[PDB]
Amino acid sequence: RPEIKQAVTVRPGMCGPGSLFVGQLGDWTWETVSAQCDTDVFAARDASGNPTYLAFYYFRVRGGRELHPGSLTFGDRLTVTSGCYDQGTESVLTLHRIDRAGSDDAQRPLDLHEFYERPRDGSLYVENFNRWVTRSAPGSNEDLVKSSPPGFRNDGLPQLPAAYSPRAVYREARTAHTFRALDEPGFRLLPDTVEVEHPVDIVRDVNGVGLLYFASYFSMVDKAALALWRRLGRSDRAFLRRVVVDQQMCYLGNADLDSVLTLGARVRVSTETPGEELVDVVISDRDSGRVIAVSTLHTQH
Amino acid sequence: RPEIKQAVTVRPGMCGPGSLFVGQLGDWTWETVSAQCDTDVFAARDASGNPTYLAFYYFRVRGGRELHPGSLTFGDRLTVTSGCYDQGTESVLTLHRIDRAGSDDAQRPLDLHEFYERPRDGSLYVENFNRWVTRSAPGSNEDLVKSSPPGFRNDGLPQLPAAYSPRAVYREARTAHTFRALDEPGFRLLPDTVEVEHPVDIVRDVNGVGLLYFASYFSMVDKAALALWRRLGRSDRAFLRRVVVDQQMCYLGNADLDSVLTLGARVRVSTETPGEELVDVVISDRDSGRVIAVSTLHTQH
């Protein structure tokens, strides 16, 4: 199955300090899987005709000072290279590489070694690990059930080696509540933390099938990050100047639309590099006793 | 200049109870103008190389019970027909018609009479009246200046007759604070109103060039509408079931990112048709003494 290459002009609907860029990346994942796995992901149903959704489970966006999501402005010309990797019948890994158009070797194919071991400052690397799910009850967003639409073709797809394991990554994050081990050298934990109550926003958090929208988890994480930034006495203009060189998200659950979520955030500062921080955000559903997401942001400010 | 026809599969990034559908419509407007007016709207600059933005000024989405934005779910197949109409060198009108794919006569071209006088229940009609603007000062979002990028080609475009005037429509709305005259028969004004303070949300309201994003005005309007809906003792599930058969928005201004806006809402109920209402929302910037938007929603619930 060939990789998909696209020439993309940055539009208002896919950039800025909100979640529009991650929204576009997720739509590109559903297009890529549809093309490579001979399944209409947008209209997928199981054998009883129940809708099945290719849910986001693990999401990484890795950039750097030379190209990060905040670098993108209206009219920028990009190259996007996308492809899927076999994770069996119930899950699939999609990769996207984003380069500036015309940049040296932008036409190169996907390279696992480049994504997992030698990422280049100037390219953006996206991993989307997705899992097929159905609701266990109409109108309930809890206890989603593993699924696989009939005719889902993972058999074409290239394999990952054992070393490159989005599953090991997300398992450790569910346990540690961070993607960057607390014992990692060269950081100090600030004493300041925040815990923000966030009722589900039924205007802005909800998708076209009545679930919490995967992109709105990035918005909730940034709401927690901004609460912590303000607690540290830092300015709104400075928040809008933050360079996010790496972000990882695990979606442990969805949530009913009447839920009140809790957004917890903490920060580690670099003892090596001024302005470098690791921010961890945990999203909880206290009423059901669930952690529904974990995120780690690596920033320079 | 030919009209642009597209086959569109509804994606998560362009539907649901948020502003993603209007975000997609605006990106389609910038693509359509780029194609028909021989100008890269995404990267437009004036002669001094200052960026110039094709700002949204008047926006209408007209549907009906048979097809409205809330009808759209993942995987729906649509037909989109788009084209521009001459409004001179500083403004341009773009129309989009949206039909279900395969529906009778979905291939028909744009028809002004159909848009302005005989809209069909089952098609969606979009009007975007846009104006070229530059900032009057870097980092300021107030007192935007009229502009026209060099080489903007309106000379190709078809003409509107005098009868069809988005300008008369928006002028009346700026004066009346509604698109549906208060003296219109068959409605009664409820005494219940809301006035909500909304600090600009720098996570969710801001675009890739540091302005308030045109789609986030629709979110702010729905926040006001939901405040009024809750004031009337109505449920969240019922709000998510609302059928918006017509909505009009005028963008009178933008706003600095530290602004605190005021969202005012009022409602008229039908004395003819149960469940039919007209909701008016006014967005104010009290500190600068400006009305920055007016919206009217026609709903069935």
| DSSP secondary structure of A232-287 | TT--HHHHHT-EEEEEEEEE-----TT-EEEEEEEEEEESSSTTEEEEEEEEEEGG
Q: CA-to-CA distance for A84 and A128, rounded, in angstroms? A: 9
Phi, psi of B12 (to 5 degrees): -55, -35
Phi, psi of A194 (to 5 degrees): -130, 155
Bridge partner residues of A279 (DSSP): A267, A297
How many angstroms away from the CA of A219 is the closest CA of chain B?
7
Q: For residue B124, which of B243, B268, B282, B272 has the smallest C-alpha distance?
A: B243
Q: CA-to-CA distance for A77 and A127, rounded, in angstroms? A: 21
Rg (CA), chain A: 19
Domain with B217, as residue range(s), is 1-301
Cβ contact (<8 Å) for B12 and A208?
A: yes
Sign of CA dihedral A156, A157, A163, A168: negative
Cβ contact (<8 Å) for A204 and B208?
A: no
Within 8 A of A254 by CB-CB distance, chain B residues are none
Domain total for chain B?
Answer: 1
Rg (CA), chain B: 19
Q: CA-to-CA distance for B122 and A190, rounded, in angstroms? A: 57
Q: CA-to-CA distance for A260 and A66, rounded, in angstroms? A: 38
Other CB atoms within 10 Å distance of the CB of residue A34 = 18
Q: Closest partner residue to A23 among B13, B213, B240, by Cβ?
A: B13
Q: CA-to-CA distance for A18 and A68, rounded, in angstroms? A: 14
- CA-to-CA dists, residue B165 to A236, B81, B125, angstroms: 41, 21, 15
Encoded amino acid at B131, one letter: R
Q: CA-to-CA distance for A10 and A16, rounded, in angstroms? A: 10
Own/partner contacts of B154-158, CB < 8 Å, gap of 24 or more, are B154/B37, B154/B86, B154/B87, B154/B88, B154/B89, B154/B92, B155/B86, B156/B1, B156/B36, B156/B37, B157/B1, B157/B36, B157/B37, B157/B84, B157/B85, B157/B86, B157/B92, B158/B83, B158/B84, B158/B85, B158/B86
Encoded amino acid at B10, one letter: V
Q: Which residues contact A286 (CB under 8 A, 6 or more apart)?
A: A260, A262
Please report the beta strands in B91-172, taking only residues with DSSP state E, as ranges in sequence order: 91-100, 124-134, 145-146
Helix-then-strand count for chain B, H and E: 5, 12
Cβ contact (<8 Å) for B208 and A73?
A: yes
Instruction: Determine contact, residues B109/B120, Cβ cutoff 8 Å.
Output: no
Bridge partner residues of A299 (DSSP): A244, A277
Within 8 A of A210 by CB-CB distance, chain B residues are 240
B16 → chain A, closest CA residue: A208
Cβ contact (<8 Å) for B74 and A204?
A: no
Q: CA-to-CA distance for A282 and A262, rounded, in angstroms? A: 8
Cβ contact (<8 Å) for A15 and B208?
A: yes
Instruction: Determine contact, residues B208/A10, Cβ cutoff 8 Å.
Output: yes
Sign of CA dihedral B24, B29, B35, B40: negative
Cβ contact (<8 Å) for B26 and A17?
A: no
Q: Does B206 touch chain A (CB under 8 A)?
A: yes
A·B CB contacts under 8 A: 132
- CA-to-CA dists, residue A266 to A110, A225, A247, A292, B202, angstroms: 34, 8, 15, 17, 20
Q: Which residues contact B163 (CB under 8 A, 6 or more apart)?
A: B116
What is the DSSP secondary structure assignment for residue A51, as one 8-state letter?
Answer: B
Q: CA-to-CA distance for B112 and B126, rounded, in angstroms? A: 12
Cα within 13 Å of Cα(B226), Cβ side: 17
Q: Does A2 touch chain B (CB under 8 A)?
A: no
Two structure tokens written together for A243: 């360079």
Two structure tokens written together for A78: 């990009």
Q: Is B254 annotated as ligand-binding?
A: yes
Phi, psi of B228 (to 5 degrees): -65, -40
Q: CA-to-CA distance for A50 and B200, rounded, in angstroms? A: 40
b/e for B80-107, b at 16 or more Cβ within 10 A?
A: bbbbbbbbeeebbbbbbbbbbeebeebe
The string of DSSP codes covering A131-179 is: EEEE-SSTT--SS-EE---TT---TTSPPPPTT--HHHHHHHHHHHSSS
Q: Does A40 touch chain B (CB under 8 A)?
A: yes
Q: Is B204 annotated as ligand-binding?
A: no
Q: CA-to-CA distance for B207 and A14, rounded, in angstroms? A: 9
Within 8 A of A223 by CB-CB distance, chain B residues are 203
Q: For residue B289, which of B164, B142, B171 has the smallest C-alpha distance?
A: B142
Cβ contact (<8 Å) for A222 and B203?
A: yes
Q: CA-to-CA distance for B30 and B25, rounded, in angstroms? A: 9
Q: Is B153 annotated as ligand-binding?
A: no
Q: CA-to-CA distance for B219 and B236, rounded, in angstroms? A: 16
Instruction: Determine contact, residues B248/B171, Cβ cutoff 8 Å.
Output: no
Q: CA-to-CA distance for B191 and A253, rounded, in angstroms? A: 42
Encoded amino acid at A59, one letter: F
Q: Is B56 annotated as ligand-binding?
A: yes
Q: CA-to-CA distance for B27 and A75, rounded, in angstroms? A: 12
Two structure tokens written together for A115: 């994504």
Other CB atoms within 10 Å distance of the CB of residue B52 = 22
Cβ contact (<8 Å) for A219 and B203?
A: yes
Other CB atoms within 10 Å distance of the CB of residue A17 = 26
The CA-to-CA distance between both ends of chain B, in Å, stands at 41
Sign of CA dihedral B167, B168, B169, B172: positive
Kind and range of the H or E element at B280? strand B276-285
Deposited experimental method: X-ray
What is the DSSP secondary structure assignment for residue B67, as one 8-state letter?
Answer: B
Q: For residue B45, which of A75, A104, A66, A196 has the smallest C-alpha distance?
A: A75
Instruction: Determine contact, residues B259/B247, Cβ cutoff 8 Å.
Output: no
Two structure tokens written together for A268: 């580690």
Two structure tokens written together for B289: 């003494």
Sign of CA dihedral B126, B131, B136, B139: positive
Instruction: Determine contact, residues A161/A191, Cβ cutoff 8 Å.
Output: no
Two structure tokens written together for A104: 């040296």
Q: Does A164 touch chain B (CB under 8 A)?
A: no
The string of DSSP codes covering B152-214 is: ---TTSPPPPTT--HHHHHHHHHHHSSSS-TT-SSEEE-S--EEEEEE--TTTSB-TTSSBPH
Instruction: Determine contact, residues A69/A61, Cβ cutoff 8 Å.
Output: yes
Within 8 A of A215 by CB-CB distance, chain B residues are 13
Bridge partner residues of B134 (DSSP): B145
Two structure tokens written together for A285: 């559903």
Instruction: Determine contact, residues B128/B215, Cβ cutoff 8 Å.
Output: no
Q: CA-to-CA distance for B28 and A91, rounded, in angstroms? A: 33
Give B210: exposed, middle or buried? Use CB within 10 Å, 0-12, 13-18, 19+.
Answer: buried
Q: CA-to-CA distance for B75 and B78, rounded, in angstroms? A: 9
Two structure tokens written together for A46: 């199981």
Instruction: Determine contact, residues B294/B177, Cβ cutoff 8 Å.
Output: yes
Instruction: Determine contact, residues B285/B90, Cβ cutoff 8 Å.
Output: no
CATH number of the domain to which A266 belongs: 3.10.129.10
User: Annotated binding site: which residue ranges of A?
Assistant: 56, 131, 252, 254
Q: CA-to-CA distance for B157 and B216, rounded, in angstroms? A: 30
Q: Which residue has the tokens 């990882």?
A: A248
